[PDB]
Amino acid sequence: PVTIIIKECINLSTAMRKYSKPFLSGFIQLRLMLNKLKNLDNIDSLTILQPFLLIVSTSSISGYITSLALDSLQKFFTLNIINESSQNYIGAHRATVNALTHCRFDDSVLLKVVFLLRSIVDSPYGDLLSNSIIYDVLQTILSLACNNRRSEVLRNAAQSTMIAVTVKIFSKLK
Amino acid sequence: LPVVRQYLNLLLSLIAPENELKHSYSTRIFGLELIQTALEISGDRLQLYPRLFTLISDPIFKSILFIIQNTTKLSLLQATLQLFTTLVVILGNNLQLQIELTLTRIFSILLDPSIIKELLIEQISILWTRSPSFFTSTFINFDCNLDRADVSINFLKALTKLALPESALTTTESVPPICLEGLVSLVDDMFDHMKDIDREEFGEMEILKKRDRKTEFIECTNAFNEKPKKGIPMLIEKGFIASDSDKDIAEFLFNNNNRMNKKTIGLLLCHPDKVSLLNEYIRLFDFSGLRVDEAIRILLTKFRLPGESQQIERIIEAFSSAYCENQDYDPSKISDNAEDDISTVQPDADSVFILSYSIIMLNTDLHNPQVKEHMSFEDYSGNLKGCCNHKDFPFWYLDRIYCSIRDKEIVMPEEHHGNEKWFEDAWNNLISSTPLELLNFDRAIFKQVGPSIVSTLFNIYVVASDDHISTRMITSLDKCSYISAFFDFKDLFNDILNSIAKGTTLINPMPLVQIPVSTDAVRFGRSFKGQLNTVVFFRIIRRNKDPKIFSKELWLNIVNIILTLYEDLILSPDIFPDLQKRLKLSNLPKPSPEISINKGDEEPTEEEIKSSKKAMECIKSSNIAASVFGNESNITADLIKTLLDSAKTEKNADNSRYFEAELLFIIELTIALFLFCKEEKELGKFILQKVFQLSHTKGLTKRTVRRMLTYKILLISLCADQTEYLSKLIN
Amino acid sequence: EMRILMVGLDGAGKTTVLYKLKLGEVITTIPTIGFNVETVQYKNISFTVWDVGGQDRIRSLWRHYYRNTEGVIFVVDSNDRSRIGEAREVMQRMLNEDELRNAAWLVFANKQDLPEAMSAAEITEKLGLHSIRNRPWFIQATCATSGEGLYEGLEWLSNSLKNST
Numbered sequence A: 001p002v003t004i005i006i007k008e009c010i011n012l013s014t015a016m017r018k019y020s021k022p023f024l025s026g027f028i029q030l031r032l033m034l035n036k037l038k039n040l041d042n043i044d045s046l047t048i049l050q051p052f053l054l055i056v057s058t059s060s061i062s063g064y065i066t067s068l069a070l071d072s073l074q075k076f077f078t079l080n081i082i083n084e085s086s087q088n089y090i091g092a093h094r095a096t097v098n099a100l101t102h103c104r105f106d107d108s109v110l111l112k113v114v115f116l117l118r119s120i121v122d123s124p125y126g127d128l129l130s131n132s133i134i135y136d137v138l139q140t141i142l143s144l145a146c147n148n149r150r151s152e153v154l155r156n157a158a159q160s161t162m163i164a165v166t167v168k169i170f171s172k173l174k
Numbered sequence B: 001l002p003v004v005r006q007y008l009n010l011l012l013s014l015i016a017p018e019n020e021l022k023h024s025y026s027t028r029i030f031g032l033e034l035i036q037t038a039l040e041i042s043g044d045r046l047q048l049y050p051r052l053f054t055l056i057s058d059p060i061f062k063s064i065l066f067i068i069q070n071t072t073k074l075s076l077l078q079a080t081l082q083l084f085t086t087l088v089v090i091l092g093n094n095l096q097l098q099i100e101l102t103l104t105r106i107f108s109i110l111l112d113p114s115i116i117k118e119l120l121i122e123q124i125s126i127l128w129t130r131s132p133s134f135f136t137s138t139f140i141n142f143d144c145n146l147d148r149a150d151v152s153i154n155f156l157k158a159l160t161k162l163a164l165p166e167s168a169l170t171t172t173e174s175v176p177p178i179c180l181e182g183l184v185s186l187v188d189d190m191f192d193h194m195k196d197i198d199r200e201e202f203g204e205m206e207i208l209k210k211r212d213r214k215t216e217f218i219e220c221t222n223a224f225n226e227k228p229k230k231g232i233p234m235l236i237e238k239g240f241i242a243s244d245s246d247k248d249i250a251e252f253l254f255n256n257n258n259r260m261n262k263k264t265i266g267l268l269l270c271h272p273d274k275v276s277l278l279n280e281y282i283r284l285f286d287f288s289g290l291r292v293d294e295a296i297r298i299l300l301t302k303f304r305l306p307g308e309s310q311q312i313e314r315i316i317e318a319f320s321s322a323y324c325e326n327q328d329y330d331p332s333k334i335s336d337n338a339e340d341d342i343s344t345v346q347p348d349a350d351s352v353f354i355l356s357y358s359i360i361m362l363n364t365d366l367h368n369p370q371v372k373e374h375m376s377f378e379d380y381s382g383n384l385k386g387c388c389n390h391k392d393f394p395f396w397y398l399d400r401i402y403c404s405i406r407d408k409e410i411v412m413p414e415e416h417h418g419n420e421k422w423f424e425d426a427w428n429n430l431i432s433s434t435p436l437e438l439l440n441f442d443r444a445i446f447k448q449v450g451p452s453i454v455s456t457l458f459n460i461y462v463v464a465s466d467d468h469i470s471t472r473m474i475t476s477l478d479k480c481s482y483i484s485a486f487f488d489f490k491d492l493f494n495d496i497l498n499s500i501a502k503g504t505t506l507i508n509p510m511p512l513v514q515i516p517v518s519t520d521a522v523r524f525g526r527s528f529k530g531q532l533n534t535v536v537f538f539r540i541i542r543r544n545k546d547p548k549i550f551s552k553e554l555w556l557n558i559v560n561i562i563l564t565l566y567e568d569l570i571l572s573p574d575i576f577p578d579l580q581k582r583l584k585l586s587n588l589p590k591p592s593p594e595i596s597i598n599k600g601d602e603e604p605t606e607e608e609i610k611s612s613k614k615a616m617e618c619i620k621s622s623n624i625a626a627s628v629f630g631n632e633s634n635i636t637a638d639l640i641k642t643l644l645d646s647a648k649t650e651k652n653a654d655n656s657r658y659f660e661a662e663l664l665f666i667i668e669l670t671i672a673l674f675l676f677c678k679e680e681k682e683l684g685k686f687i688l689q690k691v692f693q694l695s696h697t698k699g700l701t702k703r704t705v706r707r708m709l710t711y712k713i714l715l716i717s718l719c720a721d722q723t724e725y726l727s728k729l730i731n
Numbered sequence C: 001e002m003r004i005l006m007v008g009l010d011g012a013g014k015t016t017v018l019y020k021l022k023l024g025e026v027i028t029t030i031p032t033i034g035f036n037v038e039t040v041q042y043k044n045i046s047f048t049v050w051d052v053g054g055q056d057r058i059r060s061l062w063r064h065y066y067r068n069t070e071g072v073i074f075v076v077d078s079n080d081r082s083r084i085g086e087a088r089e090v091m092q093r094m095l096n097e098d099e100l101r102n103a104a105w106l107v108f109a110n111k112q113d114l115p116e117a118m119s120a121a122e123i124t125e126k127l128g129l130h131s132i133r134n135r136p137w138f139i140q141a142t143c144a145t146s147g148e149g150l151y152e153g154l155e156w157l158s159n160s161l162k163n164s165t
Helices: A003-020 A023-036 A046-057 A063-079 A089-100 A108-122 A124-128 A131-146 A152-170 B002-015 B025-039 B050-057 B059-069 B074-091 B096-110 B114-124 B133-137 B139-143 B152-162 B175-192 B206-226 B231-238 B246-255 B262-269 B275-284 B292-301 B309-326 B349-367 B377-383 B395-407 B420-431 B436-440 B442-447 B450-463 B467-487 B490-503 B519-526 B528-542 B552-567 B577-583 B606-622 B624-630 B637-645 B659-676 B683-695 B702-718 B723-730 C011-021 C081-094 C120-127 C150-164
Strands: C002-007 C038-042 C045-049 C071-076
Touching: A003 A023, A003 A046, A003 A063, A003 B074, A003 B114, A023 A046, A046 A063, A046 A089, A063 A108, A063 B025, A089 A108, A089 A124, A089 A131, A108 A124, A108 A131, A108 A152, A131 A152, B002 B025, B002 B050, B002 B059, B025 B074, B050 B059, B059 B074, B059 B096, B059 B420, B074 B114, B096 B114, B096 B139, B096 B152, B096 B420, B114 B175, B133 B139, B139 B152, B139 B206, B152 B175, B152 B442, B152 B450, B175 B450, B175 B467, B206 B231, B206 B262, B246 B275, B262 B275, B275 B309, B292 B309, B292 B349, B292 B395, B309 B349, B349 B395, B377 B395, B436 B442, B442 B467, B450 B467, B450 B490, B467 B490, B467 B528, B490 B528, B490 B552, B519 B528, B519 B606, B528 B606, B528 B624, B552 B624, B552 B637, B552 B659, B577 B659, B606 B624, B624 B659, B637 B659, B637 B683, B659 B683, B659 B702, B683 B702, B683 B723, B702 B723, C011 C038, C011 C071, C038 C150, C045 C150, C071 C081, C081 C120
Parallel strands: C002 C045, C002 C071
Antiparallel strands: C038 C045
């Protein structure tokens, strides 16, 4: 459970070091902070995801590292390590979807983020998002679908996942 | 649920090394990630299901070991090591044979380019980086039981070999710090399990009995491969074998071949005296329902064959007498036109003796690299004209023998490792075989590694210059000293303190000047390393409980340090003003400096004095007098003898300034250390003789002699029945 | 590229001698299992040495390799007086096959250091080399550690081969 966390940080840190030759300081802080403890139940889950949020949010970094970070988040929500028992999981998911809507960082990362939005919103945990965040989500998938410059297959990815989130949203009128 | 079995079969086909040409490295990376993320979800539960655990045990580890061996791409190895680390973390308990093979082999390649070694170090650091407990756990799974080879001790030795900056020539700079992190974490964690257990309370469980039994096994095997006759009797005396009968010897030799050296068994077994051992050992193997080539493979996989011919004749003659009776005989079903039938061949013992020699002939003639003239199938087939009750052999039979030997050798795999084509048999050979209590495991863990780690750390402490790494090294060394002191390991603790005392740069120009300034003082102040060394060296002194651990040279270094500190007027000599107050005497005569300037002559310039002031503040903060002498425990007869021996008897030209001062200082110390001393019957004569002999030194001013007479009467008050010395004093 | 056989009883002495011969330069990993197969160089000559066991049944298997072979070697120990009776039987047995007209025969009386080592003339008398004719033979004395005239024996082999070829 904690092995996978510093596993992911090891992978992203060595990728960053290979690519480079401000984020690594907090990354090693995450490494040292998660080294000691046994189980995640002691501490909050916003800080463990926070370096991933910082890398994915800002646009100064190329597609390799942000693709690796998005695959890391995919592994996170696939393995369900950020469980409801963990403290402040609502805030962690809210921050994840708030940062993820900014489609900034060629076309691989767009499909990775929109698949991640599908996996979050379709899941029951996606019911905990706020109205502003989910509205921004709908805005960014609409921007992806509307575009013509982008590849058409990415457009069909946006079309299908838009259909999915619309179904999930409109099921809530009961 | 069968779909899981088929899916893991498909991933076996993806990952396995046979399908190298028909797949891309991207596909292999994807397959690696697939089984990696599949393992995490139902990891331990795979133990319950036997077929899936077998699939994850034998073949997929063949794949993982083949990939880590002969891979050059960095992304491929990055994906490969992740699955291995997760499998060690989750399923490390059950499949530990493969883990031991992987760790020995990966550490073998590790200690031989730079980037692959860096990635390997960074990924294998996963195992210890989870928590310190794994580093203990591997001791109580791998090295404890006698069956498996040593891992953990080799782990520490290899890792601390790698931690040196000396590897920077052959490795990139990213390896040393992450290497050092594991050892630092281990020694830091070992300090955590110290507070609860008392020092005197601790000082064995069934688990450590295996470790005690193991250590003689290595020496026994070394003696055995040194020569054969000296090995078995000591071994039987130790009682590993049930008795001296040949049956028990065969029972040993068949089961635990991996421990022993194959060439030793090959040399011993062919001895013409031990034919009974030959017969008894030959019975243990099975050949029922197998072809002849599989029979020779089973014969020679367990032990190496001897080179010379008559020994092969003896060994195969031993083979035939048992292999003939092993297989039941049915003369009724003899046939020639039949194909792929084992029962059709029922050779007489001489016939199968000749055939068994024949496959050896084929292997040696064909596949020996030296022989230029390879064999031919037709002449080989004709060579066995009339060697089964004077009759020829089936064509398909000898054809299959020739095809089998052509496709694959007859040779043991363990020596001929590293080749790309040979890992199949080498892998297949192995799997045919298959709070107070916590501290007790760690004694042996220190006992093999304790010097080496310390030496490595001290090498870094000599090479490093940054403040942070140096102080981290110093506090880790302090915790190592705590571990040595609590565990009652004497020579090691002496090694740390002696190396520190060499490193502090106080144990061996410009004369002394007024805030004294000196060569030693400036050397102390300007250098940060010794500056931080002194404070730890006198922090460790305070906390010592058992004074027996100190050695002679350690005490000598202590008196040299305190004397050299007092030489330059750093430390005031009033360690025991309470003794003076009780005896109602004034303070000591401080040693004079050479020149005293108040505030081209060599005045110490303003840019030189700051080192002296920094040294002043550091030594004042160290609290030397309360450290060495203030604590009650350190007072011992060894300190008295070494201190009073270290007085300067003779007065050279140079030492005129501090001669009488140091002479008074030593005895002023020894009175207080005698007074707190519990027993006084024996050492009293020693201190009296040394002090009275020292009083007879000439040239002393009358002030110090008046001071010296005051001690003698107090000595004679304390010590017992020395009438002659009192008479000498009176006279 | 010629072949020579070698026959004896004591494995350790034969193996040590064989390791002693092959030193022109040693760059190798491991030999294959089975029989010892070794190389020996000399100025203008190179030779390959195989091993042979002596008994009735298997010596038929050694027959075809004799088509290219032209030489034979022995090793006989000094203080092994008991087992000369076993050795000379094998010596006479090797003469039994009649296709070996061109078989060069040698002896290496290993361990000629101990005081009870029988004389070379007495070695000939005991082995029984006098009462046979019609073939070439040679006898020589050598020591495992110190060495004595082994290269002279190889020179004799080379000169015999150049006399033949």
